[PDB]
Design an enzyme around this catalytic site. Structure first.
Site, mmCIF file in Angstrom:
data_model
loop_
_atom_site.group_PDB
_atom_site.id
_atom_site.type_symbol
_atom_site.label_atom_id
_atom_site.label_comp_id
_atom_site.label_asym_id
_atom_site.label_seq_id
_atom_site.Cartn_x
_atom_site.Cartn_y
_atom_site.Cartn_z
ATOM 1 N N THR A 79 1.507 -4.762 4.632
ATOM 2 C CA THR A 79 1.485 -5.099 5.950
ATOM 3 C C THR A 79 0.804 -6.541 6.117
ATOM 4 O O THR A 79 1.010 -7.151 7.080
ATOM 5 C CB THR A 79 0.634 -3.964 6.403
ATOM 6 O OG1 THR A 79 -0.536 -3.895 6.160
ATOM 7 C CG2 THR A 79 1.132 -2.757 6.663
ATOM 8 N N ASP A 80 0.009 -6.987 5.242
ATOM 9 C CA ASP A 80 -0.810 -8.193 5.222
ATOM 10 C C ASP A 80 0.182 -9.255 5.624
ATOM 11 O O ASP A 80 -0.177 -10.073 6.628
ATOM 12 C CB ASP A 80 -1.438 -8.488 3.954
ATOM 13 C CG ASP A 80 -2.770 -7.902 3.817
ATOM 14 O OD1 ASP A 80 -3.094 -7.066 4.457
ATOM 15 O OD2 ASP A 80 -3.239 -7.918 2.630
ATOM 16 N N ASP A 84 1.641 -7.309 -3.913
ATOM 17 C CA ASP A 84 0.772 -7.387 -2.687
ATOM 18 C C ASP A 84 1.399 -8.368 -1.883
ATOM 19 O O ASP A 84 1.720 -9.425 -2.316
ATOM 20 C CB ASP A 84 -0.591 -7.877 -3.227
ATOM 21 C CG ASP A 84 -1.507 -6.655 -3.740
ATOM 22 O OD1 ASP A 84 -0.985 -5.603 -4.004
ATOM 23 O OD2 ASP A 84 -2.672 -7.146 -4.073
ATOM 24 N N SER A 85 1.361 -8.120 -0.608
ATOM 25 C CA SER A 85 2.135 -9.084 0.294
ATOM 26 C C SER A 85 1.554 -10.342 0.632
ATOM 27 O O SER A 85 2.034 -11.266 0.930
ATOM 28 C CB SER A 85 2.548 -8.336 1.790
ATOM 29 O OG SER A 85 1.209 -8.079 2.431
ATOM 30 N N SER A 86 0.184 -10.239 0.343
ATOM 31 C CA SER A 86 -0.569 -11.779 0.277
ATOM 32 C C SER A 86 -0.110 -12.726 -0.812
ATOM 33 O O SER A 86 -0.488 -13.996 -0.274
ATOM 34 C CB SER A 86 -2.017 -11.380 0.098
ATOM 35 O OG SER A 86 -2.277 -10.887 -1.289
ATOM 36 N N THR A 146 0.999 -1.198 0.070
ATOM 37 C CA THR A 146 0.061 -0.002 -0.005
ATOM 38 C C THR A 146 0.877 1.209 -0.098
ATOM 39 O O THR A 146 0.323 2.315 -0.592
ATOM 40 C CB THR A 146 -1.052 0.050 1.240
ATOM 41 O OG1 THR A 146 -2.030 -1.027 1.151
ATOM 42 C CG2 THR A 146 -1.539 1.304 1.322
#
Lengths: 355, 355, 347, 355
Positions: B109-110, B77-79, B12
Site C-alpha cells: 500500500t505504501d 516492500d512497496s517502498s 503486507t
C-alpha cells in the site's frame, strides 16, 4: 479458552440465492465447518472436540475461541420479528448464561436496531457481550459482507469483556440501543448518530473503554419477559389530522413514541393538541423523539396540555425509545410518576442527559 | 469462462507474522488453494484443470472466473519499488496480454498510488482491467482486510470490462491515477480526492460508466518502457532556501513536480524564483501541483520567469503528475513545446480540464 | 444588466427575535444605499452590492401574514406560496422563500410538484439561529440564496443552506442543532459554493421555454404517511387507512420490507380494494426500495418509491391524486415516473 | 463586564481587493470594519465615547462585551512568503501587548496558516490566553465570502472563552493550531485536524472539548522563544529517490529535517540511501519521521539500525507541527543531543498523541 453461543434467528446472512431470489438457508453449522477462517479442523481433531463445537483459528493475541451454533426454527425475516421473538432470544441467553462467556446473534438488518434495543432493556445487569450481526449479502454468495461481519462478532465477543448488547458491522462495534439503519444497500448499513462506536477494528482493535458500561459482578442477570406490548410509534407529518391521531391513540394503547420535527416540535393546531391531552388523561404515556437522525429534543412541546405524561426523548433513537417505553410500562406495581421518572433516566446507555 | 493473471509483487498482504513482526510470505498459491472462497476444488477435479490454475466458486451472475498466480522474485516492500519494477510489471502484462482477459496485481500500500499511476501511463490503449490491491493486514492473519480486497479485485477484473489501471480496496474501485494513500492504519486507506470511485460494491455493484474510459478496440496495446528516470518530486516548505532548490534541480534532473501551497503558490522571493528560471533555461520541465489533498492549481506562479517550462498540474495527484512527467519525457523525438502541450492534456483520466 | 427577485418571507427562526425589510436595509451586505440613491430606486426595493461577476441583483421583500412556525404549515400554505409566485411570475427573474427548517423539505417537495414547467429558480432557505442574533447562519444562507437565484438559471425548487444548493425534492433534515441541518442522501447537491461556485449542470433540469407555467392548486389533501414499526397491529393499520384517506406513503424497513403477517397484509389488500393508493418508501436515510412487498395482495395499488425521500413521495402522491379524470392505472404509471428529479430509475 | 482583543492583520486573501478578476493588497481593514454593524456597534461606541481606533462588537447572546483594536502589519504578506522570522515578529507583537489584552486574533493567509499556527504554538511557551488564527478563501470585500463569519467567530471565541492555545478558526470550527493542515484549496472547509477532534464547534450552541483544552498555568510567566533554529527543512521521499539527491539535500548547514515517508513510516531501504541518512546522523543532523498520509501514525523502526537515536518517530504529528517542534527544540540553548531527542519524543504543546 472462551466459549460462545452463536444464535441464528434468520436474515439474509444465512439465506440461499435461487433464481435471483433469496430463500431460507438452514444448516449454518455444516457450512461453517468447511471454512478455515471459521473452523480449525486440525485443532478440533487434536483436542477431540465434539463436532457440534467449532473452533476459530488462533488470533494474534487472546485466548482460543470456541463456539456452538444454535439454529432457531422457524428462521425469520427480521421484518416479521416482534417483542415476543426478542423475548425468546433473551430467554435462550438466560437459559445458557452460565455455560458460555459470550453470545453472538445473527439477525436480519431490517429490524436489527429494534432487536438490539429491546434486548438491551430485557437483559438487566448483563455481564457478558451479546453481539448482533448480519449482512446485506448471504454468506453462501461468494462476494459478501457476511464472512467478515460474523467473524468479527465472534472475535469481539470471544476476546473482550464488553457487557452490553452491541451491533457489529463493517469493522465497527456499536452500542445496540444507539444504532439505526441508514443505508439499505451499502455494507456500511448502520450508524450510531449520537454516540461513538464502542469499538473499531483495523490493523488494531480500538475500544472506547471510557464509554463501555461497568460489569456489576455482585448483581445477578434479570431477564424482563414483562415487556408492555401495547406501545407504538407515530410519525407526525405536516398537516396530520387530529382524527387520525385520535384513531391511532385509541385503547388499548398504553404508550407511544411521537416522532416530531427538528428539536421536538409537532403541529400546534388546537384539535391535534386536544387529542394529545385526551390521551394523557386516559393515562397514555408519550415520549417525544426527533425525526432527525442526529441531535436532541429540547423540552416543551405540548407540555401545557399533556403535562408530565409527555416526556422528552432527548437524543434517543426511536428504536431505543420504543424499547424503553415497553420496558418501563411492563414493570409491575409502579405509580405513573415513577414510570415518568424512569423514562427520564439513562437506563442502558441509550440517552445522554444534559451536562 | 474468463481467465485472469494474478501477479504477486510483494506487500503486507502476502506476509507472515512472526513475534509481532512481519516477514516475507512466499507460496501464495499454496494458501489460496486451501481456501474455498478462492479455490473451488470440486470444479477443478471435475474439469481436470492443471493445478497451477485456481477457480473461484460460482458468483451470483456472470461467467466462471479462473486465475493463475504469478509470484515475482524477489518479493518487495512497496517502498523499495521503482520505475524499473513497474516497467517489469507492465512487461509481464504485455507478454501475457492475449492469454488473459484481466489482471490483478498484489502490491504494498505504501507506494501503490505511484505504481497504479505509473502503470496507467505505461499501458497505452489498455483494453482490459488491471486491478491493483493490497491490505493493511496479511491474509495469513485471521482478522484481516486481505481476503475481501483480493476476492473483490478478482471478481471485478473477472466480470467487468473496465479498461483502466484501478485500485480496489475496502469495497471501492478507484481510478489508479486518481488515488492517494490517506490513512496508514484504517482499512479505508485510500482516497480519490478529485474523482468519484469508478465502482462501489455493496448488495449491488454500482459502476460509474459515465466516467469509465472507452475501449479503443482498433488500436493495439503499446507499452512504454521508455520512461524517463531522472524526474523528482520537491515539496516546497515555508522559507525553503534558494541554495537548496538549486542543489535539488542540478543535472542530470530532467523534470520535477513542485508541490506548492494552496492554489499553486510557492514563495516569491527573488532568489528562489531565479533558481526556477535558471533550471528552465537548462531545459528542465516543472509541473506545479498542490500540497492540498483536494482541489486544483490555478495557473500563474513563476510563469513570468520560467515561462512555458512551468506547467500547471491542475487537480492531479502528485503520483499522477510524476508518472505523466516520466512518460512525456520518455517519448522519443518531441520538441520541448510538444512535451509541454502533452503535460497540459488529460492523457489517462488523471486530470480534469476546466470549463 | 439587472435581475430582480422576490423574497417571500413565510416564517421560521431566521426572522425571529416582523419587518425584515427594515433590518435588511441597514446591512451593507444586503443593501447598497449608495447605488439606491444614485438610481433613485423606490425604497421597497433592495439592491445587493456588486458581486464578482454577473449582473446587479435587486429584490423586493414580501412578508406573509401571519408568519408561521414551519411545523404548522400544510398543503394549503404551500399552495398559497405557489400562487404568490404565479401571480408575480413575469415581473421577477427568480424567487427566494424564507421558511422554517422543521418542514422545509416537505415545503420544497410540495412546491416542486405544484410548479409545473418552472422556468426560474425558487430557492428555499432558513436558519438554525435568527439573523438578529449576532452569531448566526442566517446572513450567509439568505445572501447565498439571493445570489444563486439572482445569477443562475436553475429552473428548480431548491434548498440553499451552509454553502450548498440541493434539489428541493431530494432533501431531508438530518440534524436538529448543526448548521449543516440538511442532507440530500441519494443525489449530489446541484451546487456548491466556495472560492468558486460549482454547478452540477449535468443534473440540473432543462428549461422548457415553450411550455407555460402551470400551478397545481388541485393537490389531494387526504394523503398520509404511516411508519411501520415492528409488531404494528393490523387493527391499527385498518384504523389508519379508513375513508376518506385516498393515498398513503408506507415507510417500511430496509429495501422495502414490511411485516408479512397475514392479518396486516389483508388490511393492505382491503384498502387497495377500496381504491387506496400506497407508495412504499424506505425508513432508511440512504438507498432504495426493491419492488415486491405485498404486491401479491394489493396488486398495482402498491407502488415502489425507489430512492425517494418520504417528503417527495407524499408530495408526488398528493399531486398525482389531485390530477383530474385519470384512471387508477394512469395514476400508478405517473407515481413510477421521475416527474421532477425526485426519483432515480434503475439502470 | 468587558474584554479587549488585539486583532493582528498580517496579510492574506481575507483583506485583499478584487481588481479585474485578480487579487491585490487591501489596506485599511479598520475603515471597512467600522462600517459593518456585525463588526462595529456605532451606537455603543458614541454612548461610551470610545476612541475611534477601538471597535466594539454588538452584544452577543451571553458573555461580556467584546472590544478590539486593529493592528495592521506593513508590509502585508501573501502567506506563501512567510518564514520563521515573520512568525517570530507576530509572537513579539503578542508579547509586547500581552498584559493590555485578554486575547488575540491573527488574520493570516490560508496557504501556510498551519505552519504559522504550529510555529506560534511553540514560540509562545506557557500561553495563558487565546491566540486565534483565521483567514478566508474569499476576500471580505467580495460580497459572497467566508471571511465575515470566520473573522467574527474568531473574535467571539477569543473574546468569550479562556482557551490558552494557538488555534485556528474556520467554517464554524476551532482547531488546535498544531494539529491542523490545509486539505482543500477551494472549499470553505479548507482545513482538517486529522488526528484530533476540534477544540470547539459552533452551531446554535457553542460546544467546547474542555477535556482536550490545555490547562492555564497561572504561576508561570509567558516565555517567547525568538531562538528558533532556522536551518530545518522538510523532505518528501518519493519512490526511487536517489541517494545523491538526499546527500545534497542534507548538506551543511542543515541542522534538522522532517522526512516524510510512506504509510506507517517506511522509506526506501536501498543501502546507499540509508548510508546517507547514517552519514547525516553522524554529522549531528536530527531527523524526524512523519507520514505522508493525512491520517494515522508512524510506527518506530525505519533506519534506526543506521541513524540510531538521531532519527525520531513523529508519531501522529502533522509535518507542520513536526517542523515547528524541531525548530524549537534545536533552538534551545546548551542541550545535549540526547536531550533534544527526548524533547522531540514528548508531547510539548498538544501536537502529538503518545501510545
Amino acid at each position: 479458552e472462551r466459549h460462545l453461543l452463536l444464535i441464528y434467528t434468520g436474515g439474509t446472512l444465512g439465506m440461499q440465492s435461487k433464481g435471483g431470489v433469496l430463500v431460507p438457508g438452514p444448516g449454518l453449522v455444516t457450512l461453517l465447518r468447511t471454512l478455515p477462517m471459521f473452523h480449525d479442523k486440525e485443532f478440533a481433531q487434536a483436542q477431540g472436540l465434539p463436532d457440534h463445537a467449532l473452533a476459530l483459528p488462533p488470533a494474534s493475541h487472546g485466548p482460543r475461541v470456541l463456539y456452538t451454533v444454535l439454529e432457531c426454527q422457524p428462521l425469520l425475516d427480521s421484518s416479521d420479528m416482534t417483542i415476543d421473538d426478542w423475548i425468546r432470544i433473551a430467554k435462550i441467553i438466560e437459559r445458557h448464561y452460565e455455560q458460555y462467556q459470550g453470545f453472538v446473534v445473527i439477525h436480519g438488518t431490517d429490524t436489527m436496531a429494534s432487536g438490539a434495543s429491546m434486548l438491551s432493556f430485557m437483559l438487566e445487569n448483563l455481564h457478558k457481550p451479546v453481539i448482533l450481526t448480519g449482512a446485506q449479502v448471504p454468506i453462501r454468495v461468494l462476494w459478501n459482507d457476511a464472512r467478515e461481519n460474523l467473524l468479527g462478532a465472534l472475535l469481539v465477543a470471544g476476546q473482550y469483556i464488553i457487557p452490553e448488547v452491541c451491533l457489529f458491522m463493517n469493522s465497527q462495534l456499536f452500542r445496540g440501543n444507539r444504532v439505526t439503519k441508514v443505508d439499505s444497500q451499502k455494507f456500511e448499513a448502520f450508524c450510531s448518530p449520537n454516540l461513538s462506536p464502542l469499538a473499531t477494528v483495523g490493523a488494531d482493535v480500538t475500544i472506547a473503554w471510557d464509554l463501555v458500561r461497568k460489569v456489576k459482578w455482585k448483581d445477578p442477570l434479570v431477564v424482563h419477559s414483562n415487556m408492555e406490548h401495547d406501545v407504538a410509534l407515530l410519525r407526525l407529518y405536516p398537516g396530520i389530522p387530529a382524527s387520525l391521531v385520535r384513531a391511532f391513540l385509541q385503547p388499548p394503547l398504553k404508550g407511544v413514541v411521537l416522532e416530531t420535527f427538528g428539536s421536538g416540535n409537532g403541529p400546534s393546531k388546537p384539535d391535534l393538541l386536544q387529542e394529545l391531552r385526551a390521551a394523557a388523561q386516559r393515562g397514555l404515556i408519550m415520549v417525544n423523539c426527533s425525526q432527525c437522525l442526529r441531535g436532541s429534543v429540547t423540552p416543551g412541546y405540548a407540555t401545557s396540555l399533556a403535562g408530565a405524561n409527555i416526556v422528552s426523548g432527548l437524543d434517543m433513537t426511536s428504536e431505543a425509545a420504543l424499547a424503553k417505553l415497553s420496558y418501563v410500562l411492563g414493570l409491575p406495581e409502579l405509580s405513573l410518576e415513577r414510570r415518568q421518572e424512569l423514562l427520564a433516566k439513562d437506563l442502558r446507555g441509550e440517552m445522554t442527559l444534559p451536562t
